[PDB]
């Protein structure tokens, strides 16, 4: 069942950090790590326990740009369930920072 797809597809300022949604209920980092090792090494990872969301960060951005693509055509599934993978708005993986100083 060939299914097309219409998307902006505006690639200008790629982001090293990648956003992930619809994560397996009670998923273990390892899982998300095994899906990132292929492309590159995971230097930073954020797993939020609430809206089934998480942000992954590979050693370099290059590893990301290539990563997404792979999924852009291939639809992965964790624990017999579909997972969401797309770019992120935040340039850097927000982890620490002074509110005022």
Residue 83 to residue 81: CA distance in whole angstroms: 7
CA neighbor of 54 nearest in space, from 97, 86, 91, 11: 86
* Number of other CB atoms surrounding residue 17 within 10 Å: 20
The answer to whether 18 and 67 are in contact (CB under 8 A) is: yes
Residue 65 to residue 39: CA distance in whole angstroms: 10
Domains of the chain, each with CATH number or no CATH: 1-101 (3.30.70.330)
Whole-Å CA distances, 7 to 10, 24, 35, 56, 90: 8, 26, 24, 23, 20
């Amino acid at each position: 069942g060939s299914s097309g797809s219409s998307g902006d597809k505006m690639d200008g300022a790629p982001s090293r950090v990648l956003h992930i949604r619809k994560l397996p209920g009670e998923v273990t980092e390892t899982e998300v790590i095994a899906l990132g090792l292929p492309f590159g090494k995971v230097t930073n990872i954020l797993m939020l326990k609430g809206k089934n969301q998480a942000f992954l960060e590979l050693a370099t951005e290059e590893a990301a740009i290539t990563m997404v693509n792979y999924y852009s055509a291939v639809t992965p599934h964790l624990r017999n369930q579909p997972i969401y993978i797309q770019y992120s708005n935040h340039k850097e993986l927000k982890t620490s920072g002074p509110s005022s100083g």
